[PDB]
Structures are given as C-alpha cells and as structure tokens.
Short mmCIF file of all heavy atoms in Angstrom, two decimals:
data_model
loop_
_atom_site.label_atom_id
_atom_site.label_comp_id
_atom_site.label_asym_id
_atom_site.label_seq_id
_atom_site.Cartn_x
_atom_site.Cartn_y
_atom_site.Cartn_z
N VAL A 1 3.35 2.85 -8.32
CA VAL A 1 3.12 3.35 -6.97
C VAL A 1 1.65 3.66 -6.76
O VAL A 1 1.04 3.25 -5.76
CB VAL A 1 4.00 4.58 -6.70
CG1 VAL A 1 3.48 5.36 -5.51
CG2 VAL A 1 5.45 4.16 -6.48
N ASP A 2 1.04 4.37 -7.72
CA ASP A 2 -0.39 4.67 -7.63
C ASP A 2 -1.23 3.40 -7.55
O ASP A 2 -2.13 3.29 -6.72
CB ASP A 2 -0.81 5.52 -8.84
CG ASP A 2 -0.15 6.89 -8.85
OD1 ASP A 2 0.40 7.30 -7.81
OD2 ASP A 2 -0.19 7.56 -9.90
N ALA A 3 -0.92 2.42 -8.41
CA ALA A 3 -1.72 1.19 -8.43
C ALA A 3 -1.58 0.41 -7.12
O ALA A 3 -2.58 -0.04 -6.55
CB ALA A 3 -1.31 0.33 -9.62
N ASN A 4 -0.34 0.25 -6.64
CA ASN A 4 -0.12 -0.50 -5.41
C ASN A 4 -0.73 0.19 -4.19
O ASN A 4 -1.15 -0.48 -3.24
CB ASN A 4 1.37 -0.78 -5.21
CG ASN A 4 1.89 -1.85 -6.16
OD1 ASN A 4 1.16 -2.78 -6.51
ND2 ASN A 4 3.14 -1.72 -6.58
N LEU A 5 -0.76 1.53 -4.17
CA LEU A 5 -1.30 2.20 -3.00
C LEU A 5 -2.79 2.50 -3.10
O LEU A 5 -3.38 2.94 -2.10
CB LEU A 5 -0.58 3.51 -2.72
CG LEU A 5 0.91 3.53 -2.44
CD1 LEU A 5 1.27 4.99 -2.33
CD2 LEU A 5 1.22 2.79 -1.15
N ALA A 6 -3.41 2.32 -4.27
CA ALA A 6 -4.85 2.53 -4.40
C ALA A 6 -5.67 1.80 -3.34
O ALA A 6 -6.56 2.44 -2.75
CB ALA A 6 -5.30 2.14 -5.81
N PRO A 7 -5.45 0.52 -3.04
CA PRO A 7 -6.25 -0.13 -1.98
C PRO A 7 -5.93 0.37 -0.57
O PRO A 7 -6.64 -0.01 0.37
CB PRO A 7 -5.90 -1.61 -2.13
CG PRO A 7 -4.57 -1.62 -2.78
CD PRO A 7 -4.59 -0.46 -3.73
N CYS A 8 -4.88 1.18 -0.39
CA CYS A 8 -4.58 1.77 0.91
C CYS A 8 -5.30 3.09 1.16
O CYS A 8 -5.24 3.60 2.28
CB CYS A 8 -3.07 2.01 1.05
SG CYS A 8 -2.05 0.54 0.95
N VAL A 9 -5.96 3.65 0.14
CA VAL A 9 -6.62 4.95 0.30
C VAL A 9 -7.63 4.95 1.45
O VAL A 9 -7.64 5.92 2.23
CB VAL A 9 -7.24 5.40 -1.03
CG1 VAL A 9 -8.07 6.66 -0.84
CG2 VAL A 9 -6.14 5.63 -2.07
N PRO A 10 -8.51 3.95 1.60
CA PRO A 10 -9.43 3.98 2.75
C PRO A 10 -8.73 4.10 4.09
O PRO A 10 -9.10 4.97 4.90
CB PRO A 10 -10.20 2.66 2.61
CG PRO A 10 -10.15 2.36 1.16
CD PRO A 10 -8.79 2.80 0.72
N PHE A 11 -7.74 3.25 4.36
CA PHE A 11 -6.99 3.38 5.61
C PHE A 11 -6.29 4.73 5.70
O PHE A 11 -6.25 5.35 6.77
CB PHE A 11 -5.98 2.25 5.75
CG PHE A 11 -4.99 2.47 6.87
CD1 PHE A 11 -5.40 2.40 8.19
CD2 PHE A 11 -3.67 2.76 6.59
CE1 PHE A 11 -4.50 2.61 9.22
CE2 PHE A 11 -2.76 2.97 7.62
CZ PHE A 11 -3.18 2.90 8.93
N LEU A 12 -5.73 5.21 4.58
CA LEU A 12 -4.94 6.43 4.61
C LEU A 12 -5.79 7.68 4.79
O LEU A 12 -5.25 8.74 5.13
CB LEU A 12 -4.10 6.55 3.34
CG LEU A 12 -2.92 5.57 3.23
CD1 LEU A 12 -2.39 5.54 1.80
CD2 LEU A 12 -1.83 5.93 4.21
N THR A 13 -7.11 7.59 4.56
CA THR A 13 -7.97 8.75 4.69
C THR A 13 -8.95 8.67 5.86
O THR A 13 -9.41 9.72 6.32
CB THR A 13 -8.78 8.98 3.40
OG1 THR A 13 -9.51 7.79 3.08
CG2 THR A 13 -7.85 9.32 2.25
N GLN A 14 -9.28 7.47 6.34
CA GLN A 14 -10.19 7.32 7.46
C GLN A 14 -9.61 6.54 8.63
O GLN A 14 -10.27 6.43 9.67
CB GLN A 14 -11.50 6.64 7.01
CG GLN A 14 -12.14 7.28 5.79
CD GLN A 14 -13.35 6.51 5.28
OE1 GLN A 14 -13.22 5.38 4.80
NE2 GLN A 14 -14.53 7.12 5.38
N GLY A 15 -8.40 5.99 8.50
CA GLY A 15 -7.79 5.27 9.60
C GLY A 15 -8.28 3.83 9.72
O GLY A 15 -8.89 3.26 8.81
N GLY A 16 -8.00 3.25 10.88
CA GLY A 16 -8.41 1.89 11.17
C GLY A 16 -7.30 0.88 10.93
O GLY A 16 -6.22 0.98 11.51
N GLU A 17 -7.57 -0.11 10.07
CA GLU A 17 -6.58 -1.12 9.74
C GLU A 17 -6.48 -1.28 8.23
O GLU A 17 -7.49 -1.25 7.52
CB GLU A 17 -6.94 -2.48 10.37
CG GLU A 17 -7.04 -2.49 11.89
CD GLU A 17 -5.70 -2.25 12.56
OE1 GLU A 17 -4.67 -2.69 12.02
OE2 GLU A 17 -5.69 -1.62 13.64
N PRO A 18 -5.26 -1.43 7.70
CA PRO A 18 -5.11 -1.63 6.25
C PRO A 18 -5.58 -3.02 5.84
O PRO A 18 -5.28 -4.01 6.51
CB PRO A 18 -3.60 -1.46 6.02
CG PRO A 18 -2.99 -1.78 7.35
CD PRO A 18 -3.96 -1.31 8.38
N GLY A 19 -6.30 -3.08 4.73
CA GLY A 19 -6.75 -4.35 4.21
C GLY A 19 -5.61 -5.16 3.62
O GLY A 19 -4.48 -4.70 3.48
N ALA A 20 -5.93 -6.42 3.30
CA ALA A 20 -4.93 -7.33 2.76
C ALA A 20 -4.31 -6.78 1.48
O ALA A 20 -3.08 -6.86 1.29
CB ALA A 20 -5.54 -8.71 2.51
N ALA A 21 -5.13 -6.23 0.59
CA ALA A 21 -4.63 -5.72 -0.68
C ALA A 21 -3.69 -4.54 -0.47
O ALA A 21 -2.69 -4.40 -1.18
CB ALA A 21 -5.80 -5.33 -1.59
N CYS A 22 -4.02 -3.66 0.48
CA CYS A 22 -3.13 -2.55 0.81
C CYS A 22 -1.75 -3.06 1.21
O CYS A 22 -0.72 -2.60 0.67
CB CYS A 22 -3.73 -1.73 1.95
SG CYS A 22 -2.57 -0.51 2.60
N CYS A 23 -1.70 -4.01 2.15
CA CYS A 23 -0.41 -4.52 2.61
C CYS A 23 0.33 -5.24 1.50
O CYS A 23 1.56 -5.17 1.41
CB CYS A 23 -0.63 -5.44 3.81
SG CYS A 23 -1.25 -4.60 5.30
N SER A 24 -0.40 -5.94 0.62
CA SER A 24 0.25 -6.59 -0.52
C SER A 24 0.89 -5.57 -1.45
O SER A 24 2.02 -5.76 -1.91
CB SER A 24 -0.76 -7.45 -1.28
OG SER A 24 -0.12 -8.20 -2.29
N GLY A 25 0.17 -4.48 -1.76
CA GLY A 25 0.75 -3.43 -2.57
C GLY A 25 1.98 -2.82 -1.94
O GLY A 25 2.98 -2.54 -2.61
N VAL A 26 1.93 -2.61 -0.62
CA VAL A 26 3.07 -2.02 0.08
C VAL A 26 4.28 -2.96 0.04
O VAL A 26 5.42 -2.51 -0.13
CB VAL A 26 2.67 -1.67 1.52
CG1 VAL A 26 3.88 -1.24 2.34
CG2 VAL A 26 1.63 -0.57 1.49
N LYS A 27 4.05 -4.26 0.18
CA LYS A 27 5.15 -5.21 0.08
C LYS A 27 5.74 -5.22 -1.33
O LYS A 27 6.96 -5.25 -1.50
CB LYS A 27 4.69 -6.61 0.48
CG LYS A 27 5.81 -7.64 0.51
CD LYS A 27 6.68 -7.43 1.75
CE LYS A 27 8.12 -7.86 1.52
NZ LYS A 27 8.79 -7.02 0.48
N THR A 28 4.87 -5.23 -2.35
CA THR A 28 5.32 -5.10 -3.73
C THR A 28 6.23 -3.89 -3.91
O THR A 28 7.31 -3.98 -4.50
CB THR A 28 4.12 -4.99 -4.67
OG1 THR A 28 3.33 -6.18 -4.60
CG2 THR A 28 4.57 -4.76 -6.10
N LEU A 29 5.79 -2.73 -3.40
CA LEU A 29 6.58 -1.51 -3.55
C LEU A 29 7.92 -1.63 -2.83
O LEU A 29 8.96 -1.22 -3.36
CB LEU A 29 5.79 -0.31 -3.02
CG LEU A 29 4.70 0.22 -3.96
CD1 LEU A 29 4.08 1.50 -3.40
CD2 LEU A 29 5.25 0.46 -5.36
N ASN A 30 7.92 -2.19 -1.62
CA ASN A 30 9.17 -2.45 -0.92
C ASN A 30 10.10 -3.33 -1.75
O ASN A 30 11.32 -3.16 -1.71
CB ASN A 30 8.88 -3.11 0.43
CG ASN A 30 10.09 -3.12 1.35
OD1 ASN A 30 10.45 -2.09 1.92
ND2 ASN A 30 10.72 -4.29 1.50
N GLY A 31 9.53 -4.27 -2.51
CA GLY A 31 10.35 -5.16 -3.31
C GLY A 31 10.90 -4.56 -4.59
O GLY A 31 12.00 -4.92 -5.02
N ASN A 32 10.15 -3.65 -5.22
CA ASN A 32 10.63 -3.01 -6.45
C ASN A 32 11.66 -1.91 -6.21
O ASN A 32 12.27 -1.44 -7.18
CB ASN A 32 9.46 -2.42 -7.24
CG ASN A 32 8.46 -3.47 -7.66
OD1 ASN A 32 8.81 -4.62 -7.93
ND2 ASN A 32 7.19 -3.07 -7.73
N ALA A 33 11.88 -1.49 -4.97
CA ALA A 33 12.77 -0.39 -4.65
C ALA A 33 14.05 -0.93 -4.02
O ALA A 33 14.30 -0.79 -2.82
CB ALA A 33 12.08 0.61 -3.72
N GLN A 34 14.87 -1.57 -4.86
CA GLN A 34 16.09 -2.22 -4.39
C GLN A 34 17.27 -1.26 -4.35
O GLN A 34 18.01 -1.22 -3.36
CB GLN A 34 16.41 -3.42 -5.28
CG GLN A 34 15.20 -4.27 -5.63
CD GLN A 34 15.22 -4.77 -7.07
OE1 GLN A 34 15.27 -5.97 -7.32
NE2 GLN A 34 15.18 -3.84 -8.02
N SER A 35 17.47 -0.48 -5.40
CA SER A 35 18.59 0.45 -5.43
C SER A 35 18.21 1.78 -4.79
O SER A 35 17.02 2.08 -4.63
CB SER A 35 19.05 0.67 -6.87
OG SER A 35 18.06 1.34 -7.63
#
C-alpha cells in the first residue's frame, strides 16, 4: 500500500491532478483487494 501510493503523495498533499504512476498504483491496489 505504501509503495503503490508513494507517487500519489504530491497530489494528495498539494492537489491538482494525479500522475500516471499514482493512478497505476491505485489500480494495482484495487486489483490486490479481491476478498
């Protein structure tokens, strides 16, 4: 979770738009949380 959300820290602390890596990490996390 920490690794996948690390590239989201800029958006999560200053706003704007999430970068490609942020969205990729978020999709990964959505995929690992099946049950």
Side-chain angles (χ1 to χ4, degrees):
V1 162
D2 295 345
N4 287 327
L5 300 175
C8 299
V9 173
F11 168 70
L12 288 166
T13 56
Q14 310 174 294
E17 300 294 325
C22 171
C23 293
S24 187
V26 172
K27 185 75 210 64
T28 297
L29 282 186
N30 193 75
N32 299 327
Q34 317 141 117
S35 66

